[PDB]
Amino acid sequence: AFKLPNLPYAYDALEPYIDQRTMEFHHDKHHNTYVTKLNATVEGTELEHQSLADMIANLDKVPEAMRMSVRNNGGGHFNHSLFWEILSPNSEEKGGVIDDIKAQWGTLDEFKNEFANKATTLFGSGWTWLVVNDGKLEIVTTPNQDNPLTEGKTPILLFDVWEHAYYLKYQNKRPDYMTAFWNIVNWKKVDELYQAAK
């Protein structure tokens, strides 16, 4: 069975960037729902003992009756799991990954500008991601709980732009939530993932 992870920090540890109340609803309600619905699909099946990354990377091979829930709920679980771990109260822009960002984009700010343009223009619910695609860094978006693993790309960083992730504090002002985000990225985690993927 899949389990809801504990937050690696207090619920109020990302203030004033993300409110305590949002961290509660986002983790204890929204993420918990994807996990529960995911378990209802996979529990008692072959898929319970497969890695979630393997399942999402090969959705096509999931039985037709289970596929939508693995996509949506399995996506939800994976996506929110990674998200908590790439946030940190002690965010410092440090890691070898950032040296490589700098090489491709010219400066970290030019990278932040692209990620911002993509995340503020993503229409409806979804995520903006930094990924490795054949040894190379690229910024992509997905709708809803879709995941770049399904397209052959490894995620090392992600940003939630479903409105539940920012509405209580920021309401319509997603660009401010983007600006806030940069202050809380666990780049140490981003870089562990980067070093594993390339």
Residue list, annotated binding site: 26, 80, 160, 164
Nearer to its own copies by Cβ, of 144 and 183: the residue is: 144
> Which listed range, 96-104, 105-113, 150-158, 159-167, lies at the site for its own copies (CB under 8 A)?
159-167
Size of the site for its own copies (CB under 8 A): 20
Taking the CA atoms of 160, 152, 50 and 8 in sequence, report the sign of the dihedral they define: negative
> Which listed range, 58-66, 131-139, 148-156, 164-172, lies at the site for its own copies (CB under 8 A)?
164-172
Buried b (16+ CB within 10 A) or exposed e, 119-149: beebeeebbbbbbbeeeebebebbeebbbbb
The whole-angstrom distance between residue 3's C-alpha and the CA centroid of its chain comes to 17
d(CA 57, CA 147): 8
> Which listed range, 38-46, 60-68, 91-99, 160-168, lies at the site for Fe ion (CB under 5 A)?
160-168
Structure tokens at 91: 């965010």
- When binding is defined by CB under 8 A, the residue of 145, 147, 154, 186 that contacts its own copies is 145
Nearer to Fe ion by Cβ, of 127 and 191: the residue is: 127
d(CA 59, CA 56): 5
> Which listed range, 91-99, 128-136, 139-147, 180-188, lies at the site for its own copies (CB under 8 A)?
139-147
- When binding is defined by CB under 8 A, the residue of 10, 40, 68, 196 that contacts its own copies is 68
Structure tokens at 75: 């996506």
- When binding is defined by CB under 5 A, the residue of 17, 127, 162, 170 that contacts Fe ion is 162
DSSP reduced 3-state for 50: coil
The whole-angstrom distance between residue 90's C-alpha and the CA centroid of its chain comes to 19
d(CA 7, CA 178): 21
Among Fe ion, its own copies, none, partner that 57 touches (CB below 5 to 8 angstroms by kind):
none
Residues that bind its own copies (CB under 8 A): 25, 29-30, 33, 68, 72, 123-126, 143-145, 162-164, 167-168, 171-172
Residues of the shown chain interacting with Fe ion in the complex, contacts defined by CB under 5 A: 160, 162, 165
